[PDB]
Symmetry: D2
Subunit: 474 residues, 4 copies
């Protein structure tokens, strides 16, 4: 298990090939756009060594201590342990960090446990898992093709190599060219280029991993959403801005030992479901969204009490709505673990029904949770003087005009600055788009659910009920 | 455990004091408006003796066999057993029967287990429970005051005795006068007049039970929603029309042994929560709504496949939405049982958090589930020829024009007649209003949730997070 | 202009070929399922002769008096006149009659004014218009193909003649075979079989009209939704149940003079838009929905005041929501008339933009308006004793328990019976499905709007705004 | 009529008493946070002198040229003229500038036309109007009390002078102390402290205006939302960030000639409605939101076409939804002008029904319009490289990977940067909160609509319809 210092030293020594506004980022640990999130990830690693949480965040195995997200669960109790670690890490950042490495460790863990799925590349997968686990490395991933012409398949874009495709194969490995649309949290040691491809997309049907410093690999950052470094003025964006980037592959060499899937469309399409990676990554997600909803509930309640709006029925109802959604997520989480069963490879996986429910329902609930905070806070959400204003000549006036019902002005503004950062700052607004799409496009996710769900039991019950209807003709 | 024949004989012998369109109902077992639901309840009782379900629906105790809904659960396994019985009974009627007696048996069971709550009336409660259990009687209940002037409390209506109040107390019991707004499924042996009263409502703070044939007690039926007796034309209304009625008390004598609460506002207000009746009745409800949602999923899928509409993405998405809601209810159900703990009286009760989530979320989901069926079926939902049309001269034409994609015309119309009866018939539409309000007014239910929920843990996490914000002033 | 007596005599003399539950309807003017709506239509005709409304409902032309819906408007004032007639007729039935003949007269009027559109059949159209106008006949229409396999086109169904198609052409006319899915209000003298067909549907690309008594023509009625004849118990279903039916064509001969379009797919697809029939029929619709919304507003307000629920903020807000929707419809109506312009044939047509807005927005608003009534009335909506109960032994008790805040019990129940009939009776629920689909499937209506709307002006404004963005590279 | 140069010189000479992060803003015309919006307002003034728009934006009167927003309309044509000016100004900034001065000029114009309303202060109002008109000054306003304890009235806050109240009256005027919660666009010459106060709020029942440089008057700015100065990277926030601020009154002297209402609660509460200011300001708003919706439609269409997503039905439907909302706003606008009538003071005012519909409906529509853009753009909305990236080493790669369907990469990113700035940047997200609340709290706005609307006509129609119901008892 890594310490924060080791993570920081690793990024400083071998920084990811990041670019910000036309320039290479030489040291993300000190760069104003990335130092906040780097310190945040470092704090997550350090927590693994805190005596209070060591037993929750790590496990011992033959003299070594590994991060809990690498644990191959054998019992439901083990699943619960993984869940508690997901939750503890999530709570540290109020569920605002959506791509902490444990999400992808869940994927790689499942891939390894179900390694036989990958055929000749099975050993590569098992070895990669051990590598990530032993070194406790941080990962980032990019799974979607460039948004160019969505009316055409990957092979029908303006150029054959817009999506990442194999240029050629050599004795050393494969050379790839193209790009992946989005990679969140590129402050990692490794990048996973993992897998719905249509038939005839063989050259794009790939799955591999690479060090983020690999020659020819570039991460182009979008506009930064860090509001500043003041924790008062920017409570969340100053520390949890994970960054999103376009990933470019300029004839990058992928060593054979890093290849997990090559030229197999079906193998790519069913990788997450067959291995159980889908189940485990969604397990981290349900714990994460439960933590996120808890944070929103806390802020909504404090805001309402803070300005005396809690006496109004509709405000109480809005907060109760968040409570209902919180309980729904807790329920999915519980059922996912309690109904867990082993898959074809013997890997215990949390229930897909419950997790499909959670990941397809939360994208609908989050925009409403965000709306509720807006409706409760109203103008208080944009009446945001800075800590500098409180420290300035008008400070005394602000302490009078911005106090709340039994709440001091500085505390009140600190709270609304947080509520604003969770909803209306560039950082906060991005979180909304993130919740709507991180797991996929709802339109296709729902179509996928329809097709995979076993609807026969219900159709049969109705056919049986209709027997009496048709008997009138006998 | 009662058989259907015993239930039918009991209603025939001592019929409830029902009135329909100005006339007394002498025999509900043969009356056209009530015979269907009577046969349906009778079938539920008969199922208790079916070898296939006897172990699910009943339990043995010292030579006797009792209905599972009377079982005082001591373990989570016992809770699961109660849940399986709720579900099996619910499935028989596609979750359309909302007031089957097991809902109220759950209430009385909890009242009895937590009998100490009732003080001097504790023995009356325990004895009443044993009575209902041993005789396996059917119950109905009425808990709301007449909807007259909602701007005023029970004591501020046009007359002091519009709500049910105590006129006087005698050596035999109490004399009550007034009315209860609604009692669903009055085809029962007993009626429960159970309990938010404001201070000063002592004369209305009552809780008692009476035989439905008690002199002075009247049940005034609303417009009947039985479409007819043909199972083809009216698959649900011909058998599951439970009926709703206004309950009148014309100076009715309630024997002291039937009094459970007398003149105690606080005791009335906290009765369901303190005894655990709330938890157990909501447990029956979550199982019931899971069954109901399963029925809607089955019909939606069959309709879409039936007319070839399943090939359209948005139709698949609508069905997937029902699947998401189904999984949400299953999740609440699972967590309610898995997180069960004993209350102050030592009674194991399913988790209130999960159940409050389920009963406050389903009223929002049901209208949408109903809407989805409407959007999928479109004009097919009102193109409803009768079985008589298929049996008539134009039958051959109908078999051609109303066939579906690989579905025979009679089967197609049988299906759409069912979908219509579940949504658009008077019977179906009532179900919507029922789901919106049976457990209470959402406005007040949400206000109640806000006030009872422990929000402190979340507020504290935020206050802790804000410590760094306020430190900038140090 | 016809009188009600003339309409009744016409239906009695030459009744439409209606079938109800396997039997031919010999006299719809006296049949229990149809006599109510027949009397209602008769009353609409009689209103044309009422001195108070004669100038609003009819116009004089060379010694004759014609119904206003036949007026070919030459000025915006004429459009306003047509609108006032639509509204006056609509108000008579609280906007619950959705297929009164003036809707189709608007279509035929436009077809006639734009007769050149039909080529060689132009004279047939002009003559048919004059026929309907002079005789002031009632019409019904059926435009959709049987809902059998929606995954395939009209030519890909289980049989080539499921949809209405031409079997052969003779010296007398064309012989057609097939069926139309739905025809509402078949208590008419004439049926219009008017027109999105895909290429290759020539044999189905038809447009013609026939007397409803034509040999081989059959109207198969769906389950009746008439609750009874009591105006107290069934205020709307006893008089406004228009009925829906499947229309069968058993090798029906259509005389050449009744053919308007034959074997021309494009001509069929653009018929409503090119002639202006779309604009005028939608004009009747916006006036109709304005009347309907006014009725819902009135009932919602009376219900709230009636039970003292009007003192609650959220109830006031719900009623205000209906007011907002009412104003939106009034606005569309006003703009449709004020922005009217002549089409290619010189026919003044109300603005399509405003009408497309109204007909695509109301299907979304109506379900909410209906929901609002449910949320306001709650249990009062199913506490529906009959007039027979008030006339019976328990009458005195009901007058006490069902009175409202300053409202007598009989008046209160009369009101809630109406609210129930507008929302929850089989009649009321059907109205919801009707609003969702009568003008077409929202999915395709929205796709149609997207494709026909001129989006260029807005795209150009954005491109212009972006000029400054691209200049940074100069 | 002012030129942009005159406006800039005025702010430079007598800058508003603005504060940003604890420091006084000496010159907002050059300050990085304010120079953009100052240039934007200056451009609006300059447009008044453009030969192409002079006749639309100004009117001639006795040798002088005044801004159209000052025109006291005498005919509907004059109303149309005011509307066209509102629209032309709005289009310049895609409807993103919500507090351009013409909104408040509409208020002052109405106040002046209805000056008699103000009694002894009538002349002050007329003179103030002439002052603003002749000098063509820019105004800002603040109408709400500090959000401290919303459970209590203005007189029940922690201090009597949290809200703005009169400390004392002198021969020169009144001395006021307190604060107003929000003032948008403080880059103005004048601030309007205009008016629902409860009885007993006399000391707070004020209405006056002051130069923004008045001693003791302070504007405390919230966190700035200017993303930068690049029009490519920040197309809107670089120029339309109006800024919001808390307004402090430190014993400010208000000259008697600037007092419009003093110590009169009722006069304050009915000021906007009685004078017609409500009608005219809402008229500017409906034109503004029509312009805003047009911009969103243009961007949505370009985005969909740009990435080839326009071929998908649901995307077309989402764009059509925006079209429906656009037409709804156009309709309200048209009806507001066409149904205009004179008020009690003889001032022609646009219809309140239509405007109440527009201002109470748009706050519900905007969040959905914003959501639609998010659903269409998906990950493209956060894949935002900078113009600096295109100008850097990876430029060639970006031109390949971020091109669209028949759209160059730079154009594509320019477009998505705009879409992002309209929805997800701090600037864009604020616009959402702004639309939800700028005209007031929806909860209270709806309650206000319920209370002021004449519901009698609809209630009467229902009572009349129910006559037949009650006749069954005769
Ligand atoms: C903040 C944020 C963070 C993210 N982080 C990551 C990450 O860390 N790793 C990663 O791999 N991905 C990440 N993503 C990407 C996310 O997984 C995708 O946004 C998502 O899967 C949907 O595809 P898309 O964005 O390419 O949109 P598109 O597919 O381009 O769709 C645009 C629109 O077109 C529609 N459309 C397009 N194609 C079809 C179709 N075939 N059928 C129906 N409709 C169609 C979509 O419905 C929609 O309305 C992130 C996204 C966001 C917004
Ligand atoms: C089909 C159906 C079956 C039912 N079956 C049963 C049954 O078997 N047994 C039983 O006991 N009950 C039954 N009920 C009753 C149900 O429990 C009640 O409808 C519900 O609790 C709400 O109260 P109410 O109907 O009296 O409506 P009301 O309280 O009259 O409310 C009408 C409207 O007024 C509002 N309003 C009124 N008071 C307030 C307030 N204080 N604060 C805020 N808003 C207010 C409500 O929000 C709403 O918009 C049934 C109801 C239906 C519809």
């Amino acid at each position: 298990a890594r310490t924060g210092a080791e993570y920081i030293e690793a990024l400083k020594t071998r920084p990811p090939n990041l670019w910000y506004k036309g320039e290479k980022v030489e040291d993300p640990t000190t760069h104003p756009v990335f130092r906040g999130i780097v310190r945040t990830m470092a704090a997550l690693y350090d927590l693994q060594h805190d005596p209070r949480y060591r037993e929750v965040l790590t496990y011992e195995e033959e003299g070594k201590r590994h991060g809990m997200s690498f644990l191959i669960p054998k019992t439901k109790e083990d699943l619960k342990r993984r869940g508690q670690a997901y939750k503890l890490w999530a709570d540290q950042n109020l569920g605002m960090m959506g791509r902490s490495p444990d999400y992808l460790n869940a994927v790689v863990m499942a891939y390894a446990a179900s390694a036989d799925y990958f055929g000749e590349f099975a050993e590569n997968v098992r070895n990669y898992y051990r590598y990530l686990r032993d070194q406790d490395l941080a990962t980032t991933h990019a799974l979607t093709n460039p948004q160019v012409n969505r009316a055409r398949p990957p092979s029908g874009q303006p150029d054959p190599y817009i999506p990442v495709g194999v240029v050629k194969q050599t004795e050393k490995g494969i050379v790839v060219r193209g790009a992946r649309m989005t990679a969140t949290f590129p402050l990692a040691d490794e990048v996973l280029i993992f897998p719905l491809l249509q038939a005839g997309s063989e050259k794009y049907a790939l799955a591999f991993a690479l060090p983020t410093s690999t020659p020819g690999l570039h991460f182009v950052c979008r506009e930064a959403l860090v509001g500043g470094d003041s924790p008062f003025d920017h409570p969340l964006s100053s520390r949890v801005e994970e960054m999103d980037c376009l990933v470019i592959f300029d004839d990058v060499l992928v060593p054979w030992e890093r290849v997990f899937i090559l030229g197999n469309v079906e193998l790519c399409n069913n990788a997450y479901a067959a291995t159980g990676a889908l189940n485990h990554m969604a397990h981290q997600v349900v714990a994460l969204k439960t933590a996120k909803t808890e944070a929103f509930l806390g802020v909504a309640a404090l805001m309402a009490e803070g300005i005396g709006a809690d006496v109004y029925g509709h405000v109480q109802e809005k907060i109760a709505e968040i409570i209902v959604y919180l309980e729904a997520m807790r329920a999915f989480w519980t059922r996912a673990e309690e109904e867990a069963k082993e898959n074809a490879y013997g890997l215990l996986v949390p229930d897909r029904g419950a997790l499909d429910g959670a990941r397809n329902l939360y994208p609908r609930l989050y925009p409403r949770i965000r709306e509720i905070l807006e409706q409760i806070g109203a103008s208080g959400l944009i009446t945001l003087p800075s800590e500098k204003d409180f420290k300035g000549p008008l400070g005394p006036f602000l302490e009078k005009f911005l106090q709340g019902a039994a709440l001091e002005a500085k505390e009140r503004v600190a709270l609304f600055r947080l509520a604003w950062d969770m909803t209306l700052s560039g950082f906060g607004a991005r979180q909304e788009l993130y919740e709507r799409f991180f797991f996929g496009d709802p339109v296709r996710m729902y179509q996928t659910l329809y097709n995979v769900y076993n609807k026969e039991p219900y159709k049969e019950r109705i056919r049986a009920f209709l027997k009496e209807s048709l008997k009138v003709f006998e």
